[PDB]
Amino acid sequence: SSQAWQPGVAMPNLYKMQRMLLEKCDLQNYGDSATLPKGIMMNVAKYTQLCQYLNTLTLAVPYNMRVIHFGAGSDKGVAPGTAVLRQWLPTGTLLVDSDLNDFVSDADSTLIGDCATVHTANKWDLIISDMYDPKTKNVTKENDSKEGFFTYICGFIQQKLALGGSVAIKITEHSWNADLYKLMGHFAWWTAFVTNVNASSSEAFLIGCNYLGKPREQIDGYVMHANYIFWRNTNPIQLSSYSLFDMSKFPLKLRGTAVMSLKEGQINDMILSLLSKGRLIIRENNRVVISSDVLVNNENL
Amino acid sequence: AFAVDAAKAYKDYLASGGQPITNCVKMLCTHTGTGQAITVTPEANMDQESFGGASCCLYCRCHIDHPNPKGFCDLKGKYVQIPTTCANDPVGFTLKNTVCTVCGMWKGYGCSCDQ
Ligand SMILES: CSC[C@H]1O[C@@H](n2cnc3c(N)ncnc32)[C@H](O)[C@@H]1O
Ligand SMILES: [Zn+2]
Ligand SMILES: [Zn+2]
């Protein structure tokens, strides 16, 4: 359809509402590759389309915005996704990124280590994760909810995502977590978004739009992943790089969304409504302070 | 008295026919920008490519200290515009050329302050 001129495809609501059983993911156009513009890396293209899609949602965009990006390194030692995020986000946005393996980055600060070692004093307005372990792509094993970095991410969202904030967390057929889907029901809105450049992969970004800090909907994550796979299994997506050629409206608009430090007892239905519309961020506005736990060992004898 | 001269090593490597550093991060953009050399957002014009700055910095990419006395990097966290004819070697380009402190264009690749 006209989907080929979009940055990608978001899971249609009717699929979210089903009760499917989990099946294997078999993509009809599996193995096809999109033709990328000359000299553009897959991950620049993929992040550009992700950001083009996020431009269509009701993201809160305050002054002094704070964004953290997990899984930001590449096997090449650079950070293409960070470079796109920094291009997309308003100038001056504080951007922190992180990966297991060492890489060089345009982020304001970079932490190298397992994401479980990462701690921050402040809350965040946006969390992006491209974290992935290709060992999960084992078709010979049962496909169960994965923990590891997904357990970290769930706790990190509940502890350090500002009310009103948003997330985009990469999943695949085998790299997913039931609690993460359940946590999507704690946002004003959510979806699973597939980039058109990578439409032949079971990859999606699980996007939570405007965090409410409480369940708005009760989601069974095992079923929702089954619903997501059923959608992918029955809706081939035409590979497309069309949206990469129109960059004129790319930068995220600095909305100046209001930031307020509120205590729990003060969040009434009026606050919850503003949060739900991308019109309010709740967090302190203090300094951004991060750290990574380092395990110390002396292997001398 | 001893410090490694990475710039001279890369230059010599290039002149001996070495393959330029690869995987500099090229950005998507309109190519309707100002054309200035190093900017907070991609500013390529029709004759340039815009790149993530850290990925085009020899010191960042080689994991070595920056010549700056405070260790500050000119490129990290910014975007560098490279002439399309030189985009096969962004690291060599940024290391061999100079930005005009008046107009912000590359000397000899956009700076018209000598006219
Ligand atoms: C961008 S490709 C996937 C990225 O996720 C990163 N990653 C995978 N698992 C973890 C983890 N537990 N902590 C931090 N980064 C991770 C990998 O090092 C890789 O660079
Ligand atoms: Zn540098
Ligand atoms: Zn000049």
Numbering used by the authors:
A (entry chain A): 6799 to 7099
B (entry chain B): 4271 to 4385
From the primary publication:
Non-structural protein 10 (nsp10) and non-structural protein 16 (nsp16) are part of the RNA synthesis complex, which is crucial for the replication of severe acute respiratory syndrome coronavirus 2 (SARS-CoV-2). Nsp16 exhibits 2’-*O*-methyltransferase activity during viral messenger RNA capping and is active in a heterodimeric complex with enzymatically inactive nsp10. It belongs to the class I methyltransferases and contains a Rossmann-fold, typical for methyltransferases, to bind SAM as the methyl donor and ^m7^GpppN-RNA (Cap0-RNA) as the methyl acceptor. The large active site of nsp16 can be divided into two main parts, the SAM and the Cap0 site ([Fig fig1]) which previously have been termed the low-affinity binding site (LBS) and high-affinity binding site (HBS), respectively.
Adenosine, 5’-methylthioadenosine (MTA), and tubercidin are structurally similar ([Fig fig2]) and electron density is observed in the adenosine cavity while SAM is fully replaced. The active site interactions are identical to those of the adenosyl moiety of SAM where the following protein and ligand atoms are within hydrogen-bonding (H-bonding) distances: Asp6912 carboxyl oxygen and exocyclic nitrogen at *C*6; Cys6913 backbone nitrogen and *N*1; the carboxyl oxygens of Asp6897 and both ribose hydroxyl groups; Tyr6930 backbone nitrogen with cyclic oxygen of the ribose ([Fig fig3]). Additionally, the backbone carbonyl oxygen of Tyr6930 is within H-bonding distance to the 5’-OH of tubercidin, adenosine and MTA. These hydroxyl groups show alternative conformations modeled with almost equal occupancies either in the ‘up’ (in close proximity to Tyr6930, occupancy: 40 %) or in the ‘down’ position (occupancy: 60 %) with the oxygen at the same position as the sulfur atom in SAM ([Fig fig3]). Glycine binds to the methionyl cavity which is occupied by an ethylene glycol in the structure with MTA alone.
